[PDB]
């Protein structure tokens, strides 16, 4: 009878040579093998969004796009306002190294990188314009130029911020005050304040407002340091410090 | 004060979000406001090291 | 002492076959009438 | 007085932009307004050496 | 001593088979109605 | 003394595994909708 | 003394693929819309 059992086990030895302690640390392995070849040498590029005006004079020099391999960047052609140009043809050199998508009928290109540091140029003519604009497109820097806008200086054939304080975007160049005894958000930008909240101001008096559909409310005003509201009949009173 | 969160961390890079909901970028040197100098990112276990001896983590209901 | 590697391969095949028997899993079926 | 940063670099040339909003390219011998002579431009590691001892690089939060 | 190797070559069947298991990633399906 | 060349076959391999892997780069696709 | 020819010869592979790789130059391309 003992036959049966040494036969048992070598048996269940045979069959599953691995075990299953042994079957979680190769997973281990192999998992931090998959993330060391995935890794990324040095640092990865910084992703920004840039914005450059492009000067048609024959003294100034053609403007640069940096890219990265395998990711893609979007250009898009505004004119002198700032309304959009439609793209009437291109010229791309060396396609082996950049890949170039488009609809043959908008003003946004789609350019993907293909090589490592293989820089080259690029050719587009716009539908209104006689001169073509050109532009260079280098691969590989420590920034990687998600999206440029780029102002042109001719006209193409086209030619607020309580919004953005509703929504909770603090107009650009604020900074903070502090509120306290309620639910209410303030920023001072040209020595005004903007305040963002749900109650209703009764005393000092506003220049402009607006609400949203369910009930918030901004407003624009010059500044001072005491409100007076009443929230939902109650009447009481705001400290503003900064 | 101002709280700040990993949103996401590979080798080199740090996506961070603050409790004002702004989106920020780091690497390995770099300014952070209100937290000081950068001097170590370490992309596993999650922990960013400052120069003022803080660590910078993922929310903890939300990681 | 032989007979552990006799028993090793009747038993190999019989066990062979309970884990294929183990695997397999079929998709069930869905009866419309009208 | 004026900042200028590097927008990009291969070796041999280094296009760099003004807080003005001006845009150069320069080569290994050339002249910079409010710097001096270039001595040395280093593609690797983002630096640029100047006469004036001065050192050209990115922008930090654009970089 | 020899039964390091006889060992290797079992186990070497085992993690190979093991890892070709690990490699797959299907695509998802989505279906319409109407 | 001969494990530097048995060491060098399979690592030849999996050196030539990797570059090879490091080597493709594939095209972009657009979607168009109407 | 010998190692300067064996060198002589992967040197050369390589060297040869590295003119033949800076050897090529292909044509633009442009494109028309309406």
Known sequence: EVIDKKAFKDMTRNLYPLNPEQVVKLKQIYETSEYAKAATPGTPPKPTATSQFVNLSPGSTPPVIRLSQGFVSSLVFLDSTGAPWPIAAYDLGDPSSFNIQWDKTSNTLMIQATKLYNYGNLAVRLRGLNTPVMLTLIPGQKAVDYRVDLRVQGYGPNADLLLHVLEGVPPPGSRRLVVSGGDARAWLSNEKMYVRTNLTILSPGWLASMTSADGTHAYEMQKSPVLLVSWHGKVMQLKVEG | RIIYYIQAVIPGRAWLIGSNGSTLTVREGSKIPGYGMVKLIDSLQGRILTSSGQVIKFSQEDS | ?34
């Open chain 3, 1 to 34: 002492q032989q007979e552990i590697q006799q028993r090793t391969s009747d038993m190999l095949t019989a066990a062979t076959q309970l884990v294929q028997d183990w695997k397999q899993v079929e998709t069930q079926v869905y009866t419309e009438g009208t």
